[PDB]
Amino acid sequence: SILNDYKRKTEGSVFWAQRARSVMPDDPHGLFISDAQGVHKTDVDGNVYLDFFGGHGALVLGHGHPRVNAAIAEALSHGVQYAASHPLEVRWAERIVAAFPSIRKLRFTGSGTETTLLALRVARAFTGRRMILRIATHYAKNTLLIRPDDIEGMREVFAQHGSDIAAFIAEPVGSHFGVTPVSDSFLREGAELARQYGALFILDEVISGFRVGNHGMQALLDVQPDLTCLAKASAGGLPGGILGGREDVMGVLSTFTGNPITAAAAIAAIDTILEDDVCAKINDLGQFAREAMNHLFARKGLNWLAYGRFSGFHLMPGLPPNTTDTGSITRAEVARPDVKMIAAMRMALILEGVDIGGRGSVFLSAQHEREHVEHLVTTFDRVLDRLADENLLSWQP
Amino acid sequence: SILNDYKRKTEGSVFWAQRARSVMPDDPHGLFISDAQGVHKTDVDGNVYLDFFGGHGALVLGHGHPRVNAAIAEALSHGVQYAASHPLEVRWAERIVAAFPSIRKLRFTGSGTETTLLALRVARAFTGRRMILRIATHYAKNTLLIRPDDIEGMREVFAQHGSDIAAFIAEPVGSHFGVTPVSDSFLREGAELARQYGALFILDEVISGFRVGNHGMQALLDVQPDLTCLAKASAGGLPGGILGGREDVMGVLSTFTGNPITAAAAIAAIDTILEDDVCAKINDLGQFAREAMNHLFARKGLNWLAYGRFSGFHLMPGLPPNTTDTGSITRAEVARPDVKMIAAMRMALILEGVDIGGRGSVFLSAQHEREHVEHLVTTFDRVLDRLADENLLSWQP
């Protein structure tokens, strides 16, 4: 079986998973990783994998890009781990202001989490209002919830509550870079409704920043958010966040200090992304990968769909591969894929030497090539056959 | 003047502060740091400072301890920046469970902020209750506030609201490691009130962990918190946090994955702290420093007080140095020190080659010695004379 093959391939991860279970809360064991470089990683058993998810978006340039690692090495040699005032942080900030037209002034934070938290406090401070509107992910007294793409629900929320809404906060593309898609038009209307009711619009660009393009998702949306949240690729793949925005709104900021090692990584990563035309190349690769996967599903006679935008894709078992409207995903109308099937899919991919994320998600990096995507297609072909072998596939759409 | 001497000593920091002001929200310029090692740091002008605050508590072992840096270097050479499953994270977790008797199971987080946030969500999940009790710092519909050491206010809060309180969360020693002191007895009573009303008790050990002793502040309090928050020294001085606690409460956990570089630093730092008896040595140094500073104030005829516990101290201008009850600080009865005086104090210390934190706070590390504390005393003697020179000191208690 897939499961027994997987356990036999990863006996060292089984060993470590047992030690982990004794000190952490509690289906099949996860993969313990010992090394990574480029677009490959190695587990504790010495198996090598082609990696399509390591970093969860934070590694736009792949594992250990030489320019980033050289900057980190030089910064480490000076011995400063934290500083509120450091030249590298200023140079990092200069890149962020230059990239995002809406970001006039910024503050560094310890994490993406602290950034969105700080953004809400700043919105409440600046407006004096108490309530925050956010988009529902699955379906907190000052939290209002709205389903993605539910324009009419959003209008009723503002009509009933708009004068008490400090801000509307939204992640573009969709939750977790598009697992639940949200339309650009829904974000633009929410920004307009926010302005008309005196609420701020906070755009969470923690994943989109320095991935979808050189000036953020907000440039693609033609929207000027009052506040922008950044981290991940905008921090060179290292820990830390950035809250940026309008001068007047950021003025309300007039324990985390600052991280010069992260700043060194961010300067090198941003310059490489700009110089090497990385966002365009991974956007093209993402479109190639979605088209190749949907052609594979069609070839095999399977009602699966590869969906998404930019340098990522996601899989929805149960929709036909020629599907163009992802509304049934956004509206949570598609049946949840069988959890045993998804687990076996992830295990079978690992048996073939490939790893992806979650229930079937992929990020592409600057170091992936079309040849790697073709290897993913060939591997998925075999994985689907093995799922069929174990009666884990359904064919009704 | 102090101010003009300071500007002349730090002209390179003036240069960088100008570039910083163009990209960040907006009294005197901060010190831009280029290098650090041991208990010293260097600014962009090449001035060297004896450092009593770098890391804000996170550097229990000083700047660039050789054992920690060797571990970080070895971990970096393998190229893995993030992993949910990595052997070093398991070994790090084994140290945390071994150190804290209350921590049976733990989850790693991206930051101290994410840890206290996650702790509140876990408390609400486990209890089903909506409200959180925390201690007031200066004097959020589900947030209840109580002043430090206000036992009677705490009882009334529980009488009026206790069945809806998911948790009482408190930082030991006091806000920012004792700037506003809170008594151990107040924490013990709050833990008892929490249990009796079905609320969880969350102890924020982000600063106390692996600083006050080898088994946390909770061992010194004889309290078994349901959840413990850790970061800073418990993460080897590197980014990341840890939420630990009771098996049943952590069971409610059954985007951050894990950081093997932080784990490498934490293993090395914890082992060094344990092996080298560091907590006892910096507790002794902290007591020495408070006594030496209060003797200095007495010698000079000044009504200033050095207060605090463990490896830190804080300064309260306006209280006599023989003061033993810090209740007037806890009750916010002491007048706020003049902001011009505090700024000049910090600048004058820098002119003498020393740096401290905030409005007069100090952390001591494993690499500080009594000789360094004596140099701080001698330097403060001169700084106080210069404050008097500029009519910045008041002598009424």
PDB file of N, CA, C and O in Angstrom, chain A residues 234-299:
ATOM      1  N   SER A 234       9.050  39.976   1.332  1.00  0.00           N
ATOM      2  CA  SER A 234       9.437  41.359   1.585  1.00  0.00           C
ATOM      3  C   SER A 234      10.416  41.473   2.739  1.00  0.00           C
ATOM      4  O   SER A 234      10.988  42.547   2.932  1.00  0.00           O
ATOM      5  N   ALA A 235      10.587  40.411   3.525  1.00  0.00           N
ATOM      6  CA  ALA A 235      11.618  40.338   4.553  1.00  0.00           C
ATOM      7  C   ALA A 235      12.736  39.364   4.172  1.00  0.00           C
ATOM      8  O   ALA A 235      13.415  38.820   5.047  1.00  0.00           O
ATOM      9  N   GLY A 236      12.949  39.133   2.871  1.00  0.00           N
ATOM     10  CA  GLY A 236      14.038  38.260   2.441  1.00  0.00           C
ATOM     11  C   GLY A 236      13.903  36.807   2.840  1.00  0.00           C
ATOM     12  O   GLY A 236      14.898  36.077   2.838  1.00  0.00           O
ATOM     13  N   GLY A 237      12.702  36.369   3.201  1.00  0.00           N
ATOM     14  CA  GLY A 237      12.491  35.022   3.690  1.00  0.00           C
ATOM     15  C   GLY A 237      12.808  34.814   5.155  1.00  0.00           C
ATOM     16  O   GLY A 237      12.666  33.688   5.648  1.00  0.00           O
ATOM     17  N   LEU A 238      13.243  35.846   5.861  1.00  0.00           N
ATOM     18  CA  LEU A 238      13.638  35.763   7.262  1.00  0.00           C
ATOM     19  C   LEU A 238      12.525  36.281   8.161  1.00  0.00           C
ATOM     20  O   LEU A 238      11.576  36.926   7.700  1.00  0.00           O
ATOM     21  N   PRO A 239      12.613  36.022   9.470  1.00  0.00           N
ATOM     22  CA  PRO A 239      11.546  36.455  10.386  1.00  0.00           C
ATOM     23  C   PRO A 239      11.399  37.964  10.436  1.00  0.00           C
ATOM     24  O   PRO A 239      12.392  38.702  10.446  1.00  0.00           O
ATOM     25  N   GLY A 240      10.157  38.417  10.508  1.00  0.00           N
ATOM     26  CA  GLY A 240       9.861  39.828  10.703  1.00  0.00           C
ATOM     27  C   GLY A 240       8.760  40.294   9.768  1.00  0.00           C
ATOM     28  O   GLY A 240       8.459  39.666   8.753  1.00  0.00           O
ATOM     29  N   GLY A 241       8.149  41.428  10.120  1.00  0.00           N
ATOM     30  CA  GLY A 241       7.100  42.021   9.319  1.00  0.00           C
ATOM     31  C   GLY A 241       7.319  43.514   9.135  1.00  0.00           C
ATOM     32  O   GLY A 241       8.270  44.100   9.660  1.00  0.00           O
ATOM     33  N   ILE A 242       6.421  44.105   8.353  1.00  0.00           N
ATOM     34  CA  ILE A 242       6.454  45.534   8.033  1.00  0.00           C
ATOM     35  C   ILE A 242       5.023  46.031   7.937  1.00  0.00           C
ATOM     36  O   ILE A 242       4.216  45.469   7.187  1.00  0.00           O
ATOM     37  N   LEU A 243       4.706  47.093   8.669  1.00  0.00           N
ATOM     38  CA  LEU A 243       3.436  47.790   8.505  1.00  0.00           C
ATOM     39  C   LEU A 243       3.738  49.118   7.817  1.00  0.00           C
ATOM     40  O   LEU A 243       4.515  49.923   8.339  1.00  0.00           O
ATOM     41  N   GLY A 244       3.149  49.340   6.640  1.00  0.00           N
ATOM     42  CA  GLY A 244       3.376  50.563   5.899  1.00  0.00           C
ATOM     43  C   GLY A 244       2.048  51.212   5.563  1.00  0.00           C
ATOM     44  O   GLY A 244       0.996  50.575   5.629  1.00  0.00           O
ATOM     45  N   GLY A 245       2.088  52.502   5.236  1.00  0.00           N
ATOM     46  CA  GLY A 245       0.839  53.123   4.831  1.00  0.00           C
ATOM     47  C   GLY A 245       0.933  54.630   4.695  1.00  0.00           C
ATOM     48  O   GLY A 245       2.020  55.198   4.567  1.00  0.00           O
ATOM     49  N   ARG A 246      -0.252  55.244   4.690  1.00  0.00           N
ATOM     50  CA  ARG A 246      -0.395  56.687   4.542  1.00  0.00           C
ATOM     51  C   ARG A 246       0.316  57.428   5.664  1.00  0.00           C
ATOM     52  O   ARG A 246       0.333  56.986   6.813  1.00  0.00           O
ATOM     53  N   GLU A 247       0.878  58.595   5.324  1.00  0.00           N
ATOM     54  CA  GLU A 247       1.606  59.373   6.323  1.00  0.00           C
ATOM     55  C   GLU A 247       0.703  59.729   7.498  1.00  0.00           C
ATOM     56  O   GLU A 247       1.073  59.535   8.663  1.00  0.00           O
ATOM     57  N   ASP A 248      -0.507  60.213   7.207  1.00  0.00           N
ATOM     58  CA  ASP A 248      -1.425  60.622   8.268  1.00  0.00           C
ATOM     59  C   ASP A 248      -1.796  59.455   9.171  1.00  0.00           C
ATOM     60  O   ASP A 248      -1.867  59.607  10.396  1.00  0.00           O
ATOM     61  N   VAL A 249      -2.061  58.285   8.588  1.00  0.00           N
ATOM     62  CA  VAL A 249      -2.471  57.148   9.404  1.00  0.00           C
ATOM     63  C   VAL A 249      -1.292  56.601  10.196  1.00  0.00           C
ATOM     64  O   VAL A 249      -1.429  56.253  11.374  1.00  0.00           O
ATOM     65  N   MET A 250      -0.118  56.502   9.566  1.00  0.00           N
ATOM     66  CA  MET A 250       1.047  56.005  10.296  1.00  0.00           C
ATOM     67  C   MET A 250       1.473  56.972  11.392  1.00  0.00           C
ATOM     68  O   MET A 250       2.205  56.570  12.309  1.00  0.00           O
ATOM     69  N   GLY A 251       1.008  58.228  11.318  1.00  0.00           N
ATOM     70  CA  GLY A 251       1.369  59.225  12.310  1.00  0.00           C
ATOM     71  C   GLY A 251       0.909  58.890  13.711  1.00  0.00           C
ATOM     72  O   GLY A 251       1.495  59.363  14.686  1.00  0.00           O
ATOM     73  N   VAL A 252      -0.134  58.067  13.840  1.00  0.00           N
ATOM     74  CA  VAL A 252      -0.570  57.640  15.164  1.00  0.00           C
ATOM     75  C   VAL A 252       0.469  56.780  15.863  1.00  0.00           C
ATOM     76  O   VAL A 252       0.330  56.512  17.060  1.00  0.00           O
ATOM     77  N   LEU A 253       1.511  56.346  15.151  1.00  0.00           N
ATOM     78  CA  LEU A 253       2.629  55.660  15.783  1.00  0.00           C
ATOM     79  C   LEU A 253       3.669  56.619  16.353  1.00  0.00           C
ATOM     80  O   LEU A 253       4.502  56.193  17.161  1.00  0.00           O
ATOM     81  N   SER A 254       3.634  57.892  15.965  1.00  0.00           N
ATOM     82  CA  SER A 254       4.475  58.914  16.587  1.00  0.00           C
ATOM     83  C   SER A 254       3.898  59.331  17.937  1.00  0.00           C
ATOM     84  O   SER A 254       4.539  59.163  18.971  1.00  0.00           O
ATOM     85  N   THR A 255       7.423  45.859  21.789  1.00  0.00           N
ATOM     86  CA  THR A 255       8.773  45.793  22.344  1.00  0.00           C
ATOM     87  C   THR A 255       9.823  45.514  21.266  1.00  0.00           C
ATOM     88  O   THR A 255      11.026  45.699  21.492  1.00  0.00           O
ATOM     89  N   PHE A 256       9.370  45.057  20.101  1.00  0.00           N
ATOM     90  CA  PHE A 256      10.292  44.730  19.021  1.00  0.00           C
ATOM     91  C   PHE A 256      10.994  45.984  18.515  1.00  0.00           C
ATOM     92  O   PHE A 256      10.369  47.028  18.300  1.00  0.00           O
ATOM     93  N   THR A 257      12.302  45.869  18.306  1.00  0.00           N
ATOM     94  CA  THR A 257      13.092  47.013  17.866  1.00  0.00           C
ATOM     95  C   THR A 257      13.367  46.953  16.368  1.00  0.00           C
ATOM     96  O   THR A 257      12.849  47.786  15.608  1.00  0.00           O
ATOM     97  N   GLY A 258      14.175  45.978  15.937  1.00  0.00           N
ATOM     98  CA  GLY A 258      14.533  45.812  14.532  1.00  0.00           C
ATOM     99  C   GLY A 258      15.571  44.726  14.332  1.00  0.00           C
ATOM    100  O   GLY A 258      16.295  44.392  15.281  1.00  0.00           O
ATOM    101  N   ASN A 259      15.648  44.126  13.141  1.00  0.00           N
ATOM    102  CA  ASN A 259      16.526  42.972  12.919  1.00  0.00           C
ATOM    103  C   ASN A 259      17.452  43.227  11.726  1.00  0.00           C
ATOM    104  O   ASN A 259      17.017  43.116  10.566  1.00  0.00           O
ATOM    105  N   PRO A 260      18.729  43.545  11.957  1.00  0.00           N
ATOM    106  CA  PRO A 260      19.631  43.822  10.824  1.00  0.00           C
ATOM    107  C   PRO A 260      19.950  42.598   9.980  1.00  0.00           C
ATOM    108  O   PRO A 260      20.327  42.762   8.813  1.00  0.00           O
ATOM    109  N   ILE A 261      19.851  41.382  10.531  1.00  0.00           N
ATOM    110  CA  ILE A 261      20.085  40.188   9.719  1.00  0.00           C
ATOM    111  C   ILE A 261      18.951  40.012   8.717  1.00  0.00           C
ATOM    112  O   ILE A 261      19.180  39.782   7.527  1.00  0.00           O
ATOM    113  N   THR A 262      17.705  40.083   9.194  1.00  0.00           N
ATOM    114  CA  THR A 262      16.574  40.106   8.269  1.00  0.00           C
ATOM    115  C   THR A 262      16.724  41.225   7.239  1.00  0.00           C
ATOM    116  O   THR A 262      16.477  41.016   6.047  1.00  0.00           O
ATOM    117  N   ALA A 263      17.134  42.420   7.676  1.00  0.00           N
ATOM    118  CA  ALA A 263      17.271  43.537   6.736  1.00  0.00           C
ATOM    119  C   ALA A 263      18.273  43.217   5.637  1.00  0.00           C
ATOM    120  O   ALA A 263      18.039  43.526   4.459  1.00  0.00           O
ATOM    121  N   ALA A 264      19.389  42.583   5.999  1.00  0.00           N
ATOM    122  CA  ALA A 264      20.383  42.204   4.998  1.00  0.00           C
ATOM    123  C   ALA A 264      19.797  41.230   3.982  1.00  0.00           C
ATOM    124  O   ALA A 264      20.017  41.367   2.773  1.00  0.00           O
ATOM    125  N   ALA A 265      19.065  40.219   4.467  1.00  0.00           N
ATOM    126  CA  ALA A 265      18.409  39.268   3.567  1.00  0.00           C
ATOM    127  C   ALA A 265      17.395  39.968   2.672  1.00  0.00           C
ATOM    128  O   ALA A 265      17.301  39.673   1.471  1.00  0.00           O
ATOM    129  N   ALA A 266      16.620  40.903   3.238  1.00  0.00           N
ATOM    130  CA  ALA A 266      15.574  41.558   2.464  1.00  0.00           C
ATOM    131  C   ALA A 266      16.161  42.421   1.360  1.00  0.00           C
ATOM    132  O   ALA A 266      15.639  42.435   0.243  1.00  0.00           O
ATOM    133  N   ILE A 267      17.243  43.147   1.653  1.00  0.00           N
ATOM    134  CA  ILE A 267      17.882  43.985   0.629  1.00  0.00           C
ATOM    135  C   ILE A 267      18.352  43.123  -0.537  1.00  0.00           C
ATOM    136  O   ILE A 267      18.120  43.442  -1.712  1.00  0.00           O
ATOM    137  N   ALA A 268      19.021  42.017  -0.224  1.00  0.00           N
ATOM    138  CA  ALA A 268      19.550  41.145  -1.266  1.00  0.00           C
ATOM    139  C   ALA A 268      18.427  40.484  -2.059  1.00  0.00           C
ATOM    140  O   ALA A 268      18.501  40.388  -3.294  1.00  0.00           O
ATOM    141  N   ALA A 269      17.382  40.025  -1.368  1.00  0.00           N
ATOM    142  CA  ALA A 269      16.273  39.356  -2.049  1.00  0.00           C
ATOM    143  C   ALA A 269      15.513  40.326  -2.943  1.00  0.00           C
ATOM    144  O   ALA A 269      15.208  40.009  -4.098  1.00  0.00           O
ATOM    145  N   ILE A 270      15.205  41.523  -2.430  1.00  0.00           N
ATOM    146  CA  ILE A 270      14.466  42.494  -3.230  1.00  0.00           C
ATOM    147  C   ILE A 270      15.271  42.882  -4.464  1.00  0.00           C
ATOM    148  O   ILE A 270      14.748  42.914  -5.584  1.00  0.00           O
ATOM    149  N   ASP A 271      16.564  43.156  -4.287  1.00  0.00           N
ATOM    150  CA  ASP A 271      17.369  43.562  -5.440  1.00  0.00           C
ATOM    151  C   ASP A 271      17.440  42.447  -6.484  1.00  0.00           C
ATOM    152  O   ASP A 271      17.378  42.714  -7.695  1.00  0.00           O
ATOM    153  N   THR A 272      17.548  41.192  -6.036  1.00  0.00           N
ATOM    154  CA  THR A 272      17.608  40.065  -6.966  1.00  0.00           C
ATOM    155  C   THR A 272      16.286  39.900  -7.697  1.00  0.00           C
ATOM    156  O   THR A 272      16.264  39.680  -8.918  1.00  0.00           O
ATOM    157  N   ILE A 273      15.179  39.996  -6.959  1.00  0.00           N
ATOM    158  CA  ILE A 273      13.851  39.871  -7.555  1.00  0.00           C
ATOM    159  C   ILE A 273      13.648  40.935  -8.625  1.00  0.00           C
ATOM    160  O   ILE A 273      13.152  40.651  -9.721  1.00  0.00           O
ATOM    161  N   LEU A 274      14.030  42.177  -8.320  1.00  0.00           N
ATOM    162  CA  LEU A 274      13.909  43.258  -9.294  1.00  0.00           C
ATOM    163  C   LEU A 274      14.834  43.032 -10.480  1.00  0.00           C
ATOM    164  O   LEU A 274      14.394  43.072 -11.637  1.00  0.00           O
ATOM    165  N   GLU A 275      16.117  42.766 -10.211  1.00  0.00           N
ATOM    166  CA  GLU A 275      17.105  42.700 -11.286  1.00  0.00           C
ATOM    167  C   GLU A 275      16.848  41.527 -12.218  1.00  0.00           C
ATOM    168  O   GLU A 275      17.078  41.627 -13.428  1.00  0.00           O
ATOM    169  N   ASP A 276      16.409  40.401 -11.670  1.00  0.00           N
ATOM    170  CA  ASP A 276      16.311  39.162 -12.426  1.00  0.00           C
ATOM    171  C   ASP A 276      14.915  38.912 -12.976  1.00  0.00           C
ATOM    172  O   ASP A 276      14.661  37.822 -13.499  1.00  0.00           O
ATOM    173  N   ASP A 277      14.012  39.892 -12.862  1.00  0.00           N
ATOM    174  CA  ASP A 277      12.670  39.825 -13.442  1.00  0.00           C
ATOM    175  C   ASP A 277      11.901  38.615 -12.913  1.00  0.00           C
ATOM    176  O   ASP A 277      11.186  37.935 -13.654  1.00  0.00           O
ATOM    177  N   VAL A 278      12.025  38.375 -11.607  1.00  0.00           N
ATOM    178  CA  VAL A 278      11.586  37.110 -11.017  1.00  0.00           C
ATOM    179  C   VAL A 278      10.069  37.001 -11.018  1.00  0.00           C
ATOM    180  O   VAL A 278       9.517  35.941 -11.341  1.00  0.00           O
ATOM    181  N   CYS A 279       9.364  38.073 -10.654  1.00  0.00           N
ATOM    182  CA  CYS A 279       7.910  37.973 -10.545  1.00  0.00           C
ATOM    183  C   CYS A 279       7.271  37.593 -11.883  1.00  0.00           C
ATOM    184  O   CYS A 279       6.381  36.732 -11.932  1.00  0.00           O
ATOM    185  N   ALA A 280       7.727  38.208 -12.978  1.00  0.00           N
ATOM    186  CA  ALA A 280       7.214  37.846 -14.299  1.00  0.00           C
ATOM    187  C   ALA A 280       7.493  36.377 -14.624  1.00  0.00           C
ATOM    188  O   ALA A 280       6.614  35.664 -15.126  1.00  0.00           O
ATOM    189  N   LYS A 281       8.692  35.891 -14.295  1.00  0.00           N
ATOM    190  CA  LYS A 281       9.065  34.518 -14.631  1.00  0.00           C
ATOM    191  C   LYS A 281       8.285  33.489 -13.808  1.00  0.00           C
ATOM    192  O   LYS A 281       7.950  32.410 -14.317  1.00  0.00           O
ATOM    193  N   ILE A 282       7.993  33.778 -12.535  1.00  0.00           N
ATOM    194  CA  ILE A 282       7.225  32.800 -11.761  1.00  0.00           C
ATOM    195  C   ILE A 282       5.737  32.929 -12.031  1.00  0.00           C
ATOM    196  O   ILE A 282       5.006  31.946 -11.872  1.00  0.00           O
ATOM    197  N   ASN A 283       5.264  34.103 -12.460  1.00  0.00           N
ATOM    198  CA  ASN A 283       3.884  34.204 -12.919  1.00  0.00           C
ATOM    199  C   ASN A 283       3.672  33.382 -14.179  1.00  0.00           C
ATOM    200  O   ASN A 283       2.645  32.699 -14.319  1.00  0.00           O
ATOM    201  N   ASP A 284       4.631  33.435 -15.107  1.00  0.00           N
ATOM    202  CA  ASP A 284       4.537  32.618 -16.314  1.00  0.00           C
ATOM    203  C   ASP A 284       4.600  31.133 -15.982  1.00  0.00           C
ATOM    204  O   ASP A 284       3.870  30.322 -16.567  1.00  0.00           O
ATOM    205  N   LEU A 285       5.484  30.753 -15.059  1.00  0.00           N
ATOM    206  CA  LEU A 285       5.593  29.352 -14.677  1.00  0.00           C
ATOM    207  C   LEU A 285       4.322  28.868 -14.001  1.00  0.00           C
ATOM    208  O   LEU A 285       3.919  27.709 -14.177  1.00  0.00           O
ATOM    209  N   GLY A 286       3.689  29.727 -13.195  1.00  0.00           N
ATOM    210  CA  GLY A 286       2.449  29.324 -12.547  1.00  0.00           C
ATOM    211  C   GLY A 286       1.335  29.072 -13.547  1.00  0.00           C
ATOM    212  O   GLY A 286       0.563  28.111 -13.414  1.00  0.00           O
ATOM    213  N   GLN A 287       1.225  29.935 -14.554  1.00  0.00           N
ATOM    214  CA  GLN A 287       0.223  29.721 -15.594  1.00  0.00           C
ATOM    215  C   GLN A 287       0.510  28.438 -16.366  1.00  0.00           C
ATOM    216  O   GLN A 287      -0.403  27.644 -16.634  1.00  0.00           O
ATOM    217  N   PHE A 288       1.775  28.222 -16.734  1.00  0.00           N
ATOM    218  CA  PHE A 288       2.193  26.965 -17.365  1.00  0.00           C
ATOM    219  C   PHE A 288       1.801  25.745 -16.532  1.00  0.00           C
ATOM    220  O   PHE A 288       1.294  24.746 -17.062  1.00  0.00           O
ATOM    221  N   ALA A 289       2.050  25.803 -15.223  1.00  0.00           N
ATOM    222  CA  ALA A 289       1.773  24.652 -14.362  1.00  0.00           C
ATOM    223  C   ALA A 289       0.281  24.369 -14.260  1.00  0.00           C
ATOM    224  O   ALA A 289      -0.145  23.206 -14.290  1.00  0.00           O
ATOM    225  N   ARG A 290      -0.536  25.412 -14.137  1.00  0.00           N
ATOM    226  CA  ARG A 290      -1.972  25.169 -14.061  1.00  0.00           C
ATOM    227  C   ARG A 290      -2.486  24.545 -15.354  1.00  0.00           C
ATOM    228  O   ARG A 290      -3.267  23.586 -15.318  1.00  0.00           O
ATOM    229  N   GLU A 291      -2.034  25.059 -16.500  1.00  0.00           N
ATOM    230  CA  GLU A 291      -2.474  24.516 -17.783  1.00  0.00           C
ATOM    231  C   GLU A 291      -1.993  23.081 -17.975  1.00  0.00           C
ATOM    232  O   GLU A 291      -2.752  22.229 -18.451  1.00  0.00           O
ATOM    233  N   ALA A 292      -0.744  22.789 -17.600  1.00  0.00           N
ATOM    234  CA  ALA A 292      -0.236  21.424 -17.723  1.00  0.00           C
ATOM    235  C   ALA A 292      -0.994  20.461 -16.814  1.00  0.00           C
ATOM    236  O   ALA A 292      -1.301  19.326 -17.216  1.00  0.00           O
ATOM    237  N   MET A 293      -1.298  20.881 -15.581  1.00  0.00           N
ATOM    238  CA  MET A 293      -2.047  19.986 -14.698  1.00  0.00           C
ATOM    239  C   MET A 293      -3.462  19.758 -15.219  1.00  0.00           C
ATOM    240  O   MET A 293      -3.979  18.635 -15.163  1.00  0.00           O
ATOM    241  N   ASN A 294      -4.124  20.805 -15.703  1.00  0.00           N
ATOM    242  CA  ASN A 294      -5.490  20.586 -16.175  1.00  0.00           C
ATOM    243  C   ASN A 294      -5.517  19.733 -17.436  1.00  0.00           C
ATOM    244  O   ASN A 294      -6.442  18.934 -17.618  1.00  0.00           O
ATOM    245  N   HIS A 295      -4.504  19.859 -18.298  1.00  0.00           N
ATOM    246  CA  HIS A 295      -4.404  18.944 -19.431  1.00  0.00           C
ATOM    247  C   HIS A 295      -4.183  17.511 -18.968  1.00  0.00           C
ATOM    248  O   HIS A 295      -4.714  16.572 -19.571  1.00  0.00           O
ATOM    249  N   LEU A 296      -3.407  17.314 -17.899  1.00  0.00           N
ATOM    250  CA  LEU A 296      -3.206  15.960 -17.393  1.00  0.00           C
ATOM    251  C   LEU A 296      -4.519  15.350 -16.902  1.00  0.00           C
ATOM    252  O   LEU A 296      -4.847  14.195 -17.226  1.00  0.00           O
ATOM    253  N   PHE A 297      -5.287  16.112 -16.111  1.00  0.00           N
ATOM    254  CA  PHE A 297      -6.563  15.593 -15.617  1.00  0.00           C
ATOM    255  C   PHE A 297      -7.489  15.244 -16.781  1.00  0.00           C
ATOM    256  O   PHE A 297      -8.147  14.195 -16.779  1.00  0.00           O
ATOM    257  N   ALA A 298      -7.539  16.109 -17.790  1.00  0.00           N
ATOM    258  CA  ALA A 298      -8.357  15.827 -18.966  1.00  0.00           C
ATOM    259  C   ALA A 298      -7.893  14.551 -19.659  1.00  0.00           C
ATOM    260  O   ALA A 298      -8.710  13.680 -19.986  1.00  0.00           O
ATOM    261  N   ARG A 299      -6.574  14.416 -19.865  1.00  0.00           N
ATOM    262  CA  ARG A 299      -6.006  13.213 -20.486  1.00  0.00           C
ATOM    263  C   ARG A 299      -6.432  11.945 -19.767  1.00  0.00           C
ATOM    264  O   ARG A 299      -6.736  10.929 -20.401  1.00  0.00           O
TER     265      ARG A 299
END
